[PDB]
Amino acid sequence: FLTNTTYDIVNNDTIDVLKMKLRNQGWPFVERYNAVEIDMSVEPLRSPGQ
Amino acid sequence: TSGSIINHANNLNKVINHVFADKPLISETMLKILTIDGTTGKDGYRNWLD
């Protein structure tokens, strides 16, 4: 959509090649970010805790 | 932890309900600024307090 190429043109392109193409065009969002884990515990009410 | 998140969620709701009860603690001047996007004034102040 952004670089103005057809799907079959970039079929063999690697991830880093696509990221480089998008950044030159000016698109910053080219990465995926990890989530943060939250610790949770249930109270031992008539049952062992989890 | 899940305990800390829940404590913040419940406590903040109690604070936000108390400030807006009867005469609000915040003047209408800020409410206009916080509602410029269409968000309800009560929700706008809560997000800013975060």
DSSP-assigned letters across all residues of chain A: --S---TTTTTT--HHHHHHHHHHHT------------------SSS---
Which of B2, B5, B7 should we substitute to test contact with A (largest number of A Cβ atoms within 10 Å)? B2
Residue B24 burial (C-beta neighbours within 10 Å; 0-12, 13-18, 19+): middle
- Here the tokens at position B23 are 């005469």
**Inter-axis angle of helices B2-19 and B41-49, to 10 degrees?**
130
Amino acid letter, B18: H
Residues of B in contact with A41 (CB under 8 A): 1-3
Beta-carbon contacts of residue B48 (< 8 Å; ≥ 6 apart):
B34
CA angle, A40 then A46 then B2, to 5°: 15
> In chain A, whose CA is at the least distance from the CA of B5?
A38
CA dihedral B42, B45, B49, B50 (to 10 degrees): 70
> In chain A, whose CA is at the least distance from the CA of B2?
A40
Q: How was this structure determined?
A: cryo-EM
Resolution (A): 3.0
